């Protein structure tokens, strides 16, 4: 029947292995270079060559992250009006290499005096490197997501679903290689070697495209029809980025095992726990949910898969507040010392691996909501305005990130006092996970109404 | 359009006010007589005239409740094969009056010696009264639910939806008048007056029918298509009846305010808290969800409204375990004494009205799942086999009640120890609400697959 014709299209890519594989390898090397900057930027700026304060190093990363979301609609509109796609990603990866090159030069003591030898020490050389990398990320993310799906666009809307499974797989594989390997080198071996590795990862990502150019391939009503879907995701992004911040804070105050008898393991390894599960669950989805949910006709659309992923975000926030209520009860009796990075944390005597049911549930959530979110921004976009809708899709991702940071500033005031105090043992973090479960539950009920009124 | 034609049918009952109103008043007086027996049966049998043990009084109520679920398919098949509907409810309410009459006779000291004057003291007079009342409830519930919807069956499947709103409203109104008024009289005034009131409520329910007779009005494939829906509700009934038991246990160990300066308020008032909210939320649904969800085309089917009600059961179980973790933390510091019934309870100094967010969520759940559950058992039944499907619908309601009681026996063993100990301050009741949230969440995901594969 029609289910057999869709399962026949599941045998996809069919000759376009080098066309799609050049896109997967480019984004694998671009995510490997993004977490080369983001993981140890504050440790680098608040260090021995640069004597910046802790607030000035954190506000430099906050303006860097916000520039990767603010520049996405402009980096995608420029790929529609003036340039193409492939000329816009080659232009951006050239600028993403130029700003990236300043970080091995500032790390080296020989080349540091050439840039800024004669409050902030080297602010013209540092902030100029953050602008070119930040505008490089925003233009790539807006443009590499439709362009990779344009190769398998010919084989229906089901082959593009299988592309975003392995596109989101190589994003997480590039994050494991950067947060695991490169972030270990930047803290314990050298910043000179540790920033030269992601700069080579940009240059290889530029070469894979020039080697890969040989194999590559009513609307006003369509704009106002999809803006209420993106506005309904702003409370979803709020819960999403505040789990990434606060599950790491729960991991720091929990008993982390030691690995050897270069010491003092990085704090970027605690952000890997989400992405390790995604490497295990995408081959599980691609081989047991592309078959199984298709020949039973179950859950075919992209907007209903976002609502499934919203269900496992809420179940993760409950499982986090249950563990945090147990941990705050257990930290009153005894408290052990552990050092993560270069600061000691007062951890309870409860194992780190009790945080695994939190990461299964946001793991399963990104299996559904994150891959189908890329499918909706691609399919529900006009042909002239693709990658400018991807630009707005990651702009409202950043709007939810800053209103989530303002939510943490709201529960930190003296009137509420949930986050009044690097120690959270006097904070009520479990009450904040229960608030995120209530915001996510109201977001789920709101999104189901928007999803039906969209169709 | 078609939404205006459905809103025109929302102006329903249209001349059949006395036909439906005789059915609403009969079930109001039948629920008032059911909780006249159930609320203080154990206190009556374990009392001054009858010297039964606490186990023998509880097993008499457990065989009584199980007989109201076991006899429902047989009391409804008898209303299809041999008798009609109205001749089956008049026959059952005659037997529901005959067994009910033994309870004022055993309560009175003059007429007690005539029945059983010369282990268990008066077991032939007591168990014979429980059989006729128990078979009377099972035959009425199987038959009064299709028969009331047969009056407004002519005006489409939307007028029957408005019947089960006010049919389920008068069930809860009959429960407030019995658990509030009659259960107060049975414990503090007299059992003679206190059981004579629900016996008059049966006799008035028999007279309203004889006064109301003047105004009243492929299938083998249809059986096996709806059995997997009833089997998928067995984990829903498991969580449903175990919340009714364990929210009362949480209310007993929580600070209940006093009302006067007849003392010692009944324990049946703590079961009223669910039904008081239902009296406030059914006029809210009938006047703001029959309009609003209809002209927006939102959530039209009965099986998707059961899945909405399954979502608020799970959110109630989380809100219950969060309050119970706070209460067990607070009971370690200080503990007050309060007497409910005739036994003292060691309550924490936390107010009873913090249990209100638990009862809003199961309140909203019965607004969706309980009314739409009656609609599915009526609409998805063959015309020859109606009220035998209602009989199976309340039989699987009872299967979930006894497998829920076996779940409490499973978490009470020494290997798990969540319910190893009338005191729950040494028990982990919060871990049992979190288990019920996990069973309900897996039931929701199971029911959505069954609901799609049904359609
Ligand atoms: C309902 C909305 O659905 C979503 C749709 C799209 C995306 C999404 C996300 C990213 C990303 O930035 N992924 C981060 C990696 C893993 N990451 C590593 C550190 C710790 C936390 C962990 C999540 C991303 C990147 C590059 C190009 C596209 C991208 N599209 C997410 C959700
Ligand atoms: C997804 C399944 O959906 C449901 C469908 C039907 C029913 C249901 C239920 C009853 C009942 O027995 N209601 C009890 C009253 C209130 N009750 C009073 C004490 C404390 C607890 C509180 C719930 C009932 C009675 C008489 C005729 C029909 C009836 N149909 C329930 C759920
Ligand atoms: C009782 C008070 C709180 C009103 C409750 C309204 C909430 C609880 C209910 C009522 C209307 C419901 C929505 C109506 C719209 C739809 C479309 C339906 O096809 C899928 C479910 C979905 C998304 C429902 C989600 C839950 C919902 C929002
Ligand atoms: C989708 C939403 C509605 C899910 C419900 C979660 C929220 C609203 C529920 C879950 C647990 C509930 C809490 C249960 C226990 C307590 C502790 C008590 O000291 C104050 C009330 C309070 C704080 C309740 C507030 C409301 C509450 C937090
Ligand atoms: C619908 C479902 C997902 C609701 C979630 C309930 C389950 C998955 C959550 C609720 C409470 C959570 C628990 C919170 C506390 C503990 C105690 C600790 O010693 C081991 C982890 C453990 C056991 C967590 C396991 C997962 C957990 C039981
Ligand atoms: C990743 C592992 C746990 C597999 C997860 C399967 C669960 C989480 C998902 C996968 C398939 C999904 C179901 C597929 C069938 C449907 C019909 C769809 O129209 C409504 C939702 C519903 C009812 C889905 C509920 C959630 C569901 C059961
Ligand atoms: C943990 O660190 C604190 C801070 O110096 C110290 O007072 C305490 O003795 C340490 N405890 C252990 C067990 O090392
Ligand atoms: C509560 O009851 C117990 C049981 O007799 C008793 O020991 C205790 O003193 C009582 N406390 C108060 C405050 O009455």
Author numbering:
A (entry chain B), B (entry chain A): 18 to 135, 150 to 248, 313 to 356, 361 to 520, 525 to 558
Q: What did the paper state?
A:
Using a phenotypic assay monitoring the degradation of the immune adapter TASL, we identify feeblin, a chemical entity which inhibits the nucleic acid-sensing TLR7/8 pathway activating IRF5 by disrupting the SLC15A4-TASL adapter module. Investigating the mechanistic involvement of SLC15A4, we recently discovered the protein TASL, encoded by an SLE-associated gene previously known as CXorf21, as an interactor essential for IRF5 activation. Through a C-terminal pLxIS motif, TASL acts as signaling adapter mediating recruitment of IRF5, in analogy to the key immune adapters MAVS, STING and TRIF for IRF3. As our previous data had shown that interfering with SLC15A4-TASL complex formation abolished TLR-induced IRF5 activation, this suggested a strategy to target the pathway with high specificity. Conveniently, TASL is regulated by proteostatic interaction with SLC15A4, so that interfering with complex formation alone leads to efficient degradation of TASL protein.
C5 is an elongated molecule comprised of an aromatic 2-(4-ethoxyphenyl)-quinoline moiety followed by an amide bond and an aliphatic 2-methyl-1-propylpiperidine. We used cryo-electron microscopy (cryo-EM) to determine the structure of C5 in complex with the SLC15A4/ALFA_Nanobody. Finally, we resolved the structure of dimeric SLC15A4/C5 complex at an overall resolution of 2.50 Å. The cryo-EM map showed well-resolved densities and was sufficient to successfully build most of the protein region, the C5 molecule and two cholesterol molecules per protomer at the dimer interface. The dimeric SLC15A4/C5 complex adopts an outward-open conformation and surface electrostatics analysis revealed that the outward-open cavity is negatively charged. We found an extra density at the bottom of this cavity which was identified as a C5 molecule in each protomer of the SLC15A4/C5 complex. C5 binding occurs at the canonical substrate binding site within the large family of proton-coupled oligopeptide (POT) transporters, where dipeptides are seen interacting in the human SLC15A1 and SLC15A2 cryo-EM structures. Assisted by the high-resolution map, we finally determined that the bound C5 molecule within the cavity adopts an L-shaped binding pose, which was coordinated by several interactions at the interface of the N- and C-bundles, including electrostatic and hydrophobic interactions. Collectively, the structural data reveal that C5 stabilizes SLC15A4 in its lysosomal outward-open conformation.
